[PDB]
Each structure stands twice: as C-alpha cells, then as structure tokens.
Write a protein that binds this ligand. Structure first.
Ligand SMILES: CC(=O)N1CCC(c2nsc(Nc3ncc(Sc4ccccn4)cc3Oc3cccnc3C)n2)CC1
Ligand SMILES: OC[C@H]1O[C@H](O)[C@H](O)[C@@H](O)[C@@H]1O
Length: 448
C-alpha cells in the first residue's frame, strides 16, 4: 500500500542521511584544520624546519620588483592533457592541446619528454615556425625545488604521474635533453612555473591586487606573494616572492588523521601515491568522483541503493567521473540529469535512487569546498598578519575544472573562506585566458 512504501522510503532516507552525516565538518573543525595548516606553512618557510615540514612552501623566483616584447612559447603539463601556446607580448594567443598516452604518464621520463618534444614539433609545423627559436615558459604542475626561475628539481610526481628517472632531476634539463635528442627544433627555455603561479600572473595582468593563485582542478594547490624576509630559503629581504605552498601534501605527516573517513583511506590505498597528497585527495577532481563512487558502493552494500546490486561500470575504478558530480548537482529537480549519468553507468535507477546519488554528491563536494576553504583562509590570514594590515583587500586568481564547472563548489567555498578570514575583503577572479598567458608574461621578464 501507499503507507508501506512511504514508511520504507522514510526509513531508507534516514539511514542514508546517517551515513552521509560522517562528511560533516563544523566551523570549529575547519578552524582546527586552518590553524594546523598555518603552523605547517610557517614551518615550510623556515630554514630550520623546511626539511621536516609537510607543506613545503617552495620559492618560485617570481618576484614583485621587476619587460621584453615578441613571440613566446608556453607549455603546460600536469592539469588535463599537454598544452602548447604561442603568445605575443607587445597579449595575443594561438593554441593546441595534446592527449597524453597512458604509457607516457607511467613509463620513463625519456618517454614523457620525447612525447612533449613530439607535440612541440607538431605545433610548430601547424604554424610554419619550426625554424624559429623562441623563449619558452614551462608550466609544470608538480612540486619543484628551484635554484632559479629556469632551474629546478622535481621533488616527487603527483596526480598519478609515475615516470621513472625524473624525481631528483632538473625538469628544465629533462626538457632540454628531449629537445636535443629529437633535434627537430630549438627553443630557449627561460622560465618554469607552477600552474598556481601561471594563474596568479595571468590574473594579476587583469587586476594588480591579485597576489594569490589557486587551482581546484585535477589537483589542489595555491601560491601567494610572501615577504622576502619570510622566505628564508632565498637570500634577501626586499620586496615579495611568490611561494608555492604545495598544500596538497598537508596531512602526509598525520596532521589530518582524525578527519579521514574509510572512503579517504580506500582512495589513498588504491592511488598511485599511497600516503601522499592526503589534503588534495579530499578536494581534487582526480579523487572527488572516486570518493562519490565508494560512498555509492557503501549505500549499495547497505541495500539503500539500486536494490543492493551494483553494475560492472559502477564497480569499475574511476568510472564515476568528477564531471558527473558536477552534472548531478546541476539537476533542476526533475532528476533527468542524474538519470542519464546512472543509465550510462549501466544502472536502472528509481526516482529515490537519483535523489540519494545527489545527496552523496553534495556530501563529498561540500566537504571538499569546506576543507579547501580552511587552506585558503590560512594563506589569507597569514598574509594579513605578515603585512600588518588592519583590513586587507586582496584578489585571488583561480583556475581548475572543479572550481569553474561545479554548480555549487564556488558558492560554498567563497562563503566559508570569508567566514574564516576576519577583516579581509576578498575578490575572486577566474583565469579565463589559460596558464599560457601567465607563463609567457613570466618568460618576458625572465628572458632578460
Ligand atoms: C632578474 C631575474 O632573472 N629574475 C628571475 C625572474 C623574476 C621574475 N620573472 S617574472 C617576475 N614577476 C612578474 N612577471 C610578470 C608579471 S605580469 C605584469 C603585468 C603588468 C605589469 C607588470 N607585470 C608580474 C610579475 O610580478 C609582479 C610584479 C609587480 C607586482 N606583483 C607581481 C606579482 N619575476 C625576476 C628576477
Ligand atoms: O595542478 C594543481 C596542483 O596539483 C598537485 O597538487 C601538484 O603537486 C601541484 O604542483 C599543482 O599546483
């Protein structure tokens, strides 16, 4: 009867909510995370504690103090795909993207950088400029210990990259060697920047108050303009230098242990980098969809979803894409968006199945937005303190598919950051023109 079905639905909804409630973080939990992060940030900056810090706070050699004109080549590795851009500084652009084969990401460094070199060759042919030798900026979206703007060693791969013979080596050297091995073109590699830094610079170009760059895409990281006096790893105390926090590695020394759920442990254990990038694994688009998948599998196991039987596709690693999380939460109310995703995953969902999936998506993405907010709040509060300002007015430049494309992440993230940053006026701007412009603007100064 109607009332039996209604009782069934009410009981099921209550059990789902009890499971999903584990993802909740109170304001005090976020403040606790924020304070621990701030302490790690201070530790990363100091000569005495840098080697023992989980948040490395890497000097970028991008400074506030310093431009050449002409054609500039920009490369981008580490986001999604490999990107080549021609930018004219006098800014006018030209662009091509290349899908990276699986064996290039997990084979040898030689294989990866040969592929990069092959892609540059393709781009130069398309624009009749393989004879041209240009200044090149390399957006390389991984933790790098810099000796200068144009020299730095890869500390470790992140986001599923596994290429052997790269870690501990000069990344600019790896690129130069590959270009030489091919011998098809010549480039002057003048700058290497993180994607956070490329974003901050490109956003700075539009708004001179931009002194923070943040990525919420495949991975999650931020950079900011630190006082040179506080950057102990670089001699000098005049002006500012951009610092790459590598905050994704927060928690890798156990700093998040009490906040980690079974789903987080499972994601971590099945990842290419177990025990590493734990904070990023709570937020990043490489992991968000997978977190949702594991939640759905728990609900299936409890007989709360899909009659307790999951499809082959739902039981496939990585099959619940982060873009599906965004699409599910974009549903207007008719459940059509949710139904389509679940249908393509080989499921036959009921209306309540769809509603439960939405609730699971909201739980994971809300926690991601709130965890991320504690990170940025930490950066912003530290900047306000360091600059001795009663009220700080700052612009944060942002890029990444999670931040840009999720229908709700942005709203939840902004509101939480603002709550956690007293006496701060924060303006958020989006990196509409890609990393390439940021890399080229850096190159235009660096090539001197
Ligand atoms: C000497 C040397 O080799 N080196 C190594 C390399 C070092 C370096 N290369 S690029 C760089 N910084 C910047 N590059 C481009 C722009 S876009 C822009 C847009 C409009 C006007 C001006 N700039 C902004 C930059 O930073 C500023 C400048 C002013 C305020 N706030 C910031 C963050 N620093 C300098 C020292
Ligand atoms: O791509 C976003 C971020 O992903 C990872 O956390 C990388 O370690 C970091 O360098 C990058 O900025």
């Amino acid at each position: 009867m109607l009332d039996d079905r209604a009782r069934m639905e009410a009981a099921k909804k209550e059990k789902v909510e009890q499971i999903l409630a584990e993802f909740q973080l109170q304001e005090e939990d976020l403040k606790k995370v924020m304070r621990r992060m701030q302490k790690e940030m201070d530790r990363g900056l100091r000569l005495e504690t840098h080697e023992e810090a989980s948040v490395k706070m890497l000097p970028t050699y991008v400074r506030s103090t310093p431009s050449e004109v002409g054609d500039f080549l920009s490369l981008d590795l580490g986001g999604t795909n490999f990107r080549v851009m021609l930018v004219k500084v006098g800014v006018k652009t030209k662009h091509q993207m290349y899908s990276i084969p699986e064996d290039a990401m997990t084979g040898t460094a030689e294989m990866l950088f040969d592929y990069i070199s092959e892609c540059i060759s393709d781009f130069l042919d398309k624009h009749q400029m393989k004879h041209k030798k240009l200044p090149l900026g390399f957006t390389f979206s991984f933790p790098v210990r810099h000796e200068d703007i144009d020299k730095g060693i890869l500390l470790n791969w992140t986001k599923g990259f596994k290429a052997s013979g790269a870690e501990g080596n000069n990344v600019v050297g790896l690129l130069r060697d590959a270009i030489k091995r091919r011998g098809d073109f010549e480039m002057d590699v003048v700058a290497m920047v993180n994607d956070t830094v490329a974003t901050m610079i490109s956003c700075y170009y539009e708004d001179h108050q931009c002194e923070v760059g943040m990525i919420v895409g495949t991975g999650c990281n931020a950079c900011y303009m630190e006082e040179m006096q506080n950057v102990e790893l670089v001699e000098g105390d005049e002006g500012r230098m951009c610092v790459n926090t590598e905050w994704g590695a927060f928690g890798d020394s156990g700093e998040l242990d009490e906040f980690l759920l079974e789903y987080d442990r499972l994601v971590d254990e099945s990842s290419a980098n177990p025990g590493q990038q734990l904070y990023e694994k709570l937020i990043g688009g490489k992991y968000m969809g997978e977190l949702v998948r594991l939640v759905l599998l728990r609900l299936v196991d409890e007989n709360l979803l899909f009659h307790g039987e999951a499809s082959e596709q739902l039981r496939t690693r990585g099959a619940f894409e982060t873009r599906f999380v965004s699409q599910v939460e974009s549903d207007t109310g008719d459940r059509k968006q949710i139904y389509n995703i679940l249908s393509t995953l080989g499921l036959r969902p009921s209306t309540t199945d769809c509603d439960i999936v939405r609730r699971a998506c909201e739980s994971v993405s809300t926690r991601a937005a709130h965890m991320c907010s504690a990170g940025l709040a930490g950066v912003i509060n530290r900047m306000r303190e360091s600059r001795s300002e009663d009220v700080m007015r700052i612009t944060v430049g942002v890029d990444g598919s999670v931040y840009k494309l999720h229908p709700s992440f942005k709203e939840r993230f902004h509101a939480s950051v603002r709550r956690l940053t007293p006496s701060c006026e924060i303006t958020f701007i989006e990196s509409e023109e890609g990393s390439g412009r940021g890399a080229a603007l850096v190159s235009a100064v660096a090539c001197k």
